[model samples]
Target: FSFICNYFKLLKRQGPGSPEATRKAVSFINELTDDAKIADIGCGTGGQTLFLADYVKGQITGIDLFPDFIEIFNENAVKANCADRVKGITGSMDNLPFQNEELDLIWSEGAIYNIGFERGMNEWSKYLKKGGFIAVSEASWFTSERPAEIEDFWMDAYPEISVIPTCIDKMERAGYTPTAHFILPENCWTEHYFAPQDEVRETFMKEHAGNKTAMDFMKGQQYERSLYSKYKDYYGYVFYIGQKR
Candidate 1:
């Protein structure tokens, strides 16, 4: 677990998102009936879960692939004063245990592609009540064209990444009415996402002295942050909010 924490390295917010924006996203879905049942998929370290607990007065069941992530998630729930209503579950998004149409919301941040974006949108919809909501922050192309340097990078890195228009179409095809969508603020990448983790990475390298596996993970995390610093203008995440029809 210590090594895993080093790999993530103090990145509570994870990816290109911020607590403020996450709060804003939930607020946008203001019609949520009291205590809407919600699931936070791929809740690594419960980053979004913390802020989400602050915003939604509901029972939040966090689902994750790693049991350690769930362990930490429960701890965060207690510290954030959400343990009364929040619980963590270890499971795959592809095989969630919830019955069909039992959840009022299926929320995901930066983890939509764990089951692939198209499949997630189409399949996760089944878990939501007929009129329930879904909100996700997905990696997206901010522009139609980009330099080969960045284009080639994502082409090989995440070939499934698509622009805003295509994403909207996909949501419609998946049986949801697009309600609101916005590009996450750029500072989400710099201030809220990357810089703090870089600082922690230093401590991790020093503390984990001779462990090459952890060191390699730290390097990759650093490169990911570096890519955002250099190519952020070309690619960004968009918060997509939808309601089942």
Candidate 2:
């Protein structure tokens, strides 16, 4: 698992997400002002953060645990000419850099698994204003029952992965109003995520040739992809948009 960071550091997005999906998730949040304060936690390389910079009228701070990703994030911000309001800082999601009630919105995409979904909602909720919003992409079970193979796979990966209604209940319990929730389309995984990785996998393998850890890492990646391809209808990422009470 130490190689996990090394492998993800070489990619554009550290997880599954698309510009269209991010836009759709952002659309559900209302009343964001030009001076709104937004923090994108676990922002990897600013892929979605940079995309968000164009749509929202607010100061955007992207935080990640990896300094390498933060550097790339800052570079991308400058390259995109969004440096004025967009900045990347190296930090942990559990220990944030904002004050209580300082943020108008909090966004996390495909990265909340780091701190667990329910805990993230409970803890991160305190950073928001009275009516602040939270938008996150979470891995979820689409059906009540699934093949044991996929079930075990997800359970081992993220034990908190639950059905949509249960996730909504969690949001409400954490002091938020569940405004909207939607499953990300297949293209988000196949087209935006896996396809790009396929383009880079060979090069990554060649660079780390003869290393068993790297080989195993890639093997795990392939297995995950295979699972998604085989049981995509049973599980996938869902965008949950909530408003703080």
Candidate 3:
């Protein structure tokens, strides 16, 4: 699995968009104090975690269900001189290990879908101090009337997928007051995220030509990458910066 793991490190973004979008979402948390407590749940490989450490220079906890991912995040934290403020924890998204009213900010990029959007906002809000902030990015329909080609794909893939307006409505219903919102640009995927992985994925296919398992996984990811241009106009990630009401 090391080959699988290494290839992914170069293309670590699990969902749509990349660190550029994450930076945009984190920008909304500028109101918090330097010493405020924050959590980055579903923080795969600490992309957003490390970004938060540099931007806020505050105490930030990163959570991933996988122990190996958490271990890697800690190592990078120390190397980045963020060890003093950033800590990594291995736990599930819905079953977070933090206390109620414990965090000043709860940030999760490309993660809320793990528990479904509304459910995650409701559950994670319990950890935020009343009046705290949450900045998260999620996939949504960008156009109201999309062709069946893309709509059919998502309906089967993410039945609960929503649009920008519905997302804001959900946030309000979850007792949150949205402060900022926007769609991540296409370069966030094509250039920063997917393109970087093209060569790595191709080489892995050639080197492991006979290995069906790894090849199939790479093919699946590549297939998704190939679909970006065909359907991006209809769907993209929507970033939501909200506060606990």
Candidate 4:
């Protein structure tokens, strides 16, 4: 799992997301004040967090399971000149360190799968104050039925993947009033995620020359990219924004 971070660290983001998409997602939440407290769970390197800082005046705390990512996140925060308001700390989403109802907004981009969507929504919702916002990007089915090949792949990778409506229902069940949800643009995968990997793949391969694990990992990534290219219409990342009830 840590090896995955090594490769991801070299990239601008650890997942499929773009600043534009993040900005669009943030637009739906108009409740931020200077004193608002935000928690960005599984915030890899704080890429989306920095993008968010440009729009909101809230104090953001980025939490990730990886220490190296947290270090880089903090460094990026300093570089962005928001270190005083934005800080990264090493922590797991499953066991988040926050007081009950302490957050004004909870944001997680392309990372909530670590705790599973339903469970994450239910568990993390308690950390938000009443009327707080919960924004997260999750892999969702575009249609009711998808090809078995892609379906099986997602089932194996993340069995919790659900249709957009079902995911919204889960959000509601978890005590949020579903506000807005939208599919991420195709380029978020094609250009932002895969294109960057093109430059780093060879370097990674050369570095881990004969290591079978690294080779297999790279192969897996390639396979995932291929799947996205072939079956993008069937499934993709969807940003779900909800207000805590």
Candidate 5:
């Protein structure tokens, strides 16, 4: 269980948008509607959940499969003064607690692929009201015009990884109307993973080089850096927004 906790703790520290990114992402959602009943599926530490709570005067639910994450997130919800509006639940995405056609929005950041996007979109669609939107960020295949090595990388890492066109087809088939889609540039990836990690690595090596935790963190960061450098053009995060039919 500690392994699972540590894995998320590392992500919370290194995830895209720190506090600032959460603010901007929430702002993006706010522009869609004034009062949106949102759910942050896979809301680990509740950063995005709290951010949204600040902007929208609507009920926001944060769901995660891990109880420990839910506990920590609940505490965060309290600290952010959103305890009344924000709720945390220990639940799996496949079996959300909400009734059918309830939510106005669903948000997932880098977590939907764990259950795989197609299954997720199909299963979660039941919880969304007609015309409600879902915003998700996923690792995407760069260009439709690519060579064999790039294809092999996705095959090995994310077999379900698809180009934007394929993803659009999947969204339509899943009973959603596509609205906005964009490819995040390599610079965003570099800034998210590489820049702050240099500082995190230096501090860890100096203070805890012999510790297993520090070693694991350093190794994972190095591997990600290598992968990104090798496939900069062929890899990116794609953000998609779709309306439920």
Candidate 6:
């Protein structure tokens, strides 16, 4: 399980830049006021963090749980010439290193589910200034009405997952207003995971012919294929923007 984190780090190192991620991140920052202090929660390798720093002339902080990731991110930031405006920190999202009501925007990309979305909304809201914004991408149930079997599958696999309406309700209850929401098409998933996995498979087979990591990567690819094939109608990724009052 621990190795999975390192594996993802390696994947990110080789994967294509996330244009979809950058687009959504830019959209989120465009909604904020000038001079906003933005926190990129779970900013793995600073992909989206660098994008946000470049998009907005505001102060940007990139925080993640992995020290190795932060190191890579800082190095990239320097390479991108955004180190002066972008800062990287290693910390848990549940315990942020910021003063109360200090941030104007919180940006997370495919990361909040680690702490549960509802809990993340409730907990991270404490750091938002009045009228602050939160933008995050999370796995979501496609339809609120689904078979019990599908529900059970998601609960067992990702207990924190919820549909968009439920997530909006949770945000509203946590003293934030749902501002903008969008559904990411399934093709984006193919681009993000499957495409890169294919490249990894090719490289692994050539270089480390019989490595167990190669086998695990193959299994992961198969699992994703199965997920899309069998559960296509039941799941999706959603982008949510909430504003604190």
Candidate closest to the true structure, highest lDDT: 4
- For candidate 6, list the clashing residue pairs, or say none: none
Model 2 lDDT per residue over 1-245, tens place: 45577667667888888899999998998867779999999897888998788778899999988777888888988888889899999889889988999999999996522888899999999999988999999999999999999999889988999999999999999999999999999998988889888878888878888998888878888998999999999999999999999
Give the per-residue lDDT of model 6 (tens digit) for 1-245: 55556656666532222556557645754455457788989887777676667566677888888887888888888898878778888999878999999998888876422788888899999999988888887778888767776677678867888878898999999998888887776666677656766666667667666778767766765776676667778876688888897
Q: What residue runs in model 6 are displaced by over 4 Å at the alpha carbon?
A: 13-18, 21-34, 145-153, 206-214
Candidate 4 off by > 4 Å: none
lDDT of 4 by residue, 164-184 (tens): 989999999999999999999
Backbone clashes in model 3, listed as residue pairs: none
Off by more than 4 A, model 3: 1-7, 10-12, 111-113
Q: Once superposed on the true structure, which residue ranges of model 2 sit more than 4 Å away at CA? A: none
> What's the residue-level lDDT of 245 in candidate 1?
81
- Candidate with the larger lDDT of 3 and 4: 4
Q: Score each candidate by Cα lDDT.
A: 0.80, 0.89, 0.78, 0.89, 0.71, 0.75
Q: Candidate 2 — number of clashing residue pairs?
A: 0
Candidate 1 deviant stretches above 4 angstroms:
1-6, 208-210
lDDT (Cα, tens digit) per residue for candidate 1, span 1-245:
46654355256655667898788789767555556788898877888887887777678899887776778789888887768788998898888889888998888997422766778899899889988889998888989998887788788867889899988889999999998899899888888777777677678768877988877876777777777778888888889999988
Clashing pairs in 1: none
Q: Rank the candidates by lDDT, best first.
A: 4, 2, 1, 3, 6, 5
Q: Which candidate, 1 or 6, has the higher lDDT? A: 1
